[PDB]
Enzyme design. Structure first.
Site, short mmCIF file in Angstrom:
data_model
loop_
_atom_site.label_atom_id
_atom_site.label_comp_id
_atom_site.label_asym_id
_atom_site.label_seq_id
_atom_site.Cartn_x
_atom_site.Cartn_y
_atom_site.Cartn_z
N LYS A 53 1.39 4.26 -2.98
CA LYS A 53 1.05 5.64 -2.67
C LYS A 53 2.26 6.58 -2.81
CE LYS A 53 -3.08 4.45 -2.17
NZ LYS A 53 -4.02 4.86 -3.24
N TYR A 85 0.83 -1.20 0.00
CA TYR A 85 0.00 0.00 0.00
C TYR A 85 0.86 1.25 0.00
CZ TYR A 85 -3.64 3.32 1.28
OH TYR A 85 -4.52 4.36 1.30
#
Ligand SMILES: NC(=O)c1ccc[n+]([C@@H]2O[C@H](COP(=O)([O-])OP(=O)(O)OC[C@H]3O[C@@H](n4cnc5c(N)ncnc54)[C@H](O)[C@@H]3O)[C@@H](O)[C@H]2O)c1
Lengths: 241, 241, 243, 238
Positions: free
Chosen positions: C147, C143
């Protein structure tokens, strides 16, 4: 380091003492600076109050006069403080700004011309992860460490052309005599309290002063000859919180 | 903004003036602070020297007493200095620290309890991309702006629980009387130098005070209700250099 | 004036933030094209269902909007896949999914949208990234890196395309009240509102973001008040540090 | 380093070669990985293509099987791309993501369990200042280096508890055969000109980077976890 000369401030503290010891073992002659230093094994003793402009302005010149040259400066002196800004007094302010930021500024301003004339040198500032990132309840401490990190990066870029390498070591949690004394005075077994604090660090322990000193020596060494204005975090993986 | 009361420092300068104008247009009552503010259309005039402890400490209370409440503080006053640290004088140091860092500290320290007792508020600090990143030959300016950015973030997290939203706008190049003045002294025609500077910005122009003021207004508005401790860069795509 | 007469593309339009951004833009007078896996229930001005992992669909989205609504002023890259785990617990399927949606798709959309906007005098692109990625956090390696990648892309593009009058910026939330979050609580037998309030106590502001808290920043970034912002990563976190 | 085993990827390249040299000089046994590694002095040769999942997944196990242990991984392989995003092809994308991000992902995912079982280790990723800060006309390169820096920091936090120290060195300008290719502009003139844009006054040689890699793999760096160590000679990204 053989034949080199280093100034170390905050020399009577945990990290300071470890840096002095490691430099002298590496063959440097070391000038030690703190409020009081007579008991420290070193090659020149320069006690004083960093809040006094004349003492901080004069430190690098005192080392060059006393030991014949100045190759390395370690800005390690520092004031610990805490609180939200609403709990920060004028006296807290003056003390932390004076020692954590203004003092390094004065010492570097004085040391740089000396090192430039000699063909180069190394300055290592001991800042903190607290200040690279914000943390709660320590506004003054963080802002002075952020000022010091910024200074390191600007000076690092400004004076690289003169062969002067200016970088910083940024610890997080560190085991020191005073941390342990604090625990003992509050009724905690310091060894157990230190271990417990270590469990909050991904690596599983807080730093020893030597963990930090070893990074200071790297930065002052030829291995780090291409680092200028770098902020090297030494935190065991532990985020500011 | 109708019904709201704002304090703006550096009210007589380029950005400060645009901020006052924008808040008043939107219906806020504005107290203006600077060395001299006689010219300025505003709801309360508070002339003084931010370097004076008692004046800075007293500003927020003067606005709350004068206008009945304090909803917004814009810390916009600022001093520009230039030089490598080796060219930075003791007078330079005192001036920049006092106005760029110590003044905002005193004003926030005082404003926070007032706003907390009233159910919250918003503080906007005008910092700079110079500071967030290092730039050449402006060591003192960068270090004060980095200290202010750090303070913004720490306070932002310390005081959000009291409903106080504390953020910063971080410009890079802005067409202001002081940017011009700086050029003229050096000694380039300001209008030509500003035009040339505008051309170094990817967006293709220098920011005007209104470009910054519009972001300050955002930060004090309900649209920014979830921003706390944010450092909002407004640089037209231009890196610090 | 404002968003009146403008056209926007919003991805992840069936989700919390996406849906709030669509509503806010249409209320401000923009026509909005919505994209998500399925979009039939969504009040919108053009419907473009599809799978962002398909190169052809992501590549073609801006052109489909320009053809369908006649222009393209604003792109909101909002679609994202939630994942968790140390890297040692990350499968190849986890990898392909997160990279494909969180990074590759916005890359393809922006690559296609930029020429269209450049030719028409400019525009705005807003990516929804995360504070997770800006700083590292435990147990969410995939994740975070996706990002971080998106944040980096936002800044490089912002710098590269500002000369074309294209403003590319990002909003970076931390804690947000989403249906996935609330469904997750409901299945543990929790009262989702109470659990959401509880999670709010870990935020200095005292609450997690509603999708509207985030959408109003997205609207700011696409508006005239943000005309000097290029390549900005705007953190919207209520004071909460990544942890 | 006496008696330790290191894996170095991109070992046929400039930085990779200097890293291998330095490790063996310090007494480590080194396995070298690159498309071809025939020329390279080393203790195990593992030629192969990092874009092949099986090869990358299998590298750590191959080293442990071949030299008996795995103490150190240096993820040094890297692909240089350039262009604004609008000039970036699908082939560019696949190549850069594959080598700069997925490969280290696969290698770390496989190396970690081995190291954890042995009581710890070190992984050093060669990322870049480009990516930490944005720079003009290299969008793909920056994003892959940013992804790798983030992975380094997250992994650093996640696996420190197993005694694994995960850190990155982040160069800016470095004189490498690949730099010189892609110039060919005349290479040595271009390298020298680039050199003068660095405040230190010269661009890095591979050894300038390798010595930092060695510090990070070493006992002196035992408290660094998830650190991104910039080595840029004072030069900002531009
Ligand atoms: N011009 C730009 O490019 C640049 C870039 C980034 C941020 N800044 C910052 O933006 C803010 C606004 O300044 P500006 O750009 O409009 O320049 P400016 O000089 O036109 O206005 C700034 C104001 O600060 C006030 N000030 C200075 N010393 C003071 C003191 N001792 N007591 C009270 N007030 C004092 C001044 O009198 C002045 O009116 C500052 O914080 C400045 O440093 C501007």
């Amino acid at each position: 380091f053989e034949g080199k000369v280093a100034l170390v401030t905050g020399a009577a503290g945990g990290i300071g003492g470890a840096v002095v010891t490691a430099l002298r073992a590496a063959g440097a002659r070391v000038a030690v600076a703190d409020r009081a230093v007579a008991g420290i094994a070193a090659d020149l003793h320069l006690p004083g109050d960093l809040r006094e402009a004349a003492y901080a302005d004069g430190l690098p010149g005192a080392v060059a006069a006393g030991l014949g040259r100045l190759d390395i400066v370690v800005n390690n002196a520092g004031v610990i403080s805490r609180g939200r800004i609403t709990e920060t007094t004028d006296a807290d302010w003056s003390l932390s700004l004076g020692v954590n930021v203004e003092a390094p500024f004065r010492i570097c301003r004085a040391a740089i011309p000396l090192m430039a004339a000699a063909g180069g040198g190394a300055i290592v500032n001991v800042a903190s992860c607290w200040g690279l990132r914000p943390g709660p309840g320590h506004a003054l401490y963080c802002l002075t460490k952020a000022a010091l990190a910024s200074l390191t990066q600007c000076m690092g870029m400004d004076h690289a052309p003169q062969g002067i390498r200016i970088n910083a070591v940024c610890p997080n949690e560190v085991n020191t005599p005073m941390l342990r004394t604090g625990f003992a005075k509050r009724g905690f077994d310091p060894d157990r309290a230190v271990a417990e604090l270590g469990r909050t660090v991904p690596l599983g322990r807080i730093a020893e002063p030597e963990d930090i000193a070893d990074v200071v020596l790297f930065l002052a060494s030829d291995a780090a000859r291409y680092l200028c204005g770098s902020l090297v975090e030494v935190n065991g993986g532990k985020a500011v919180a």
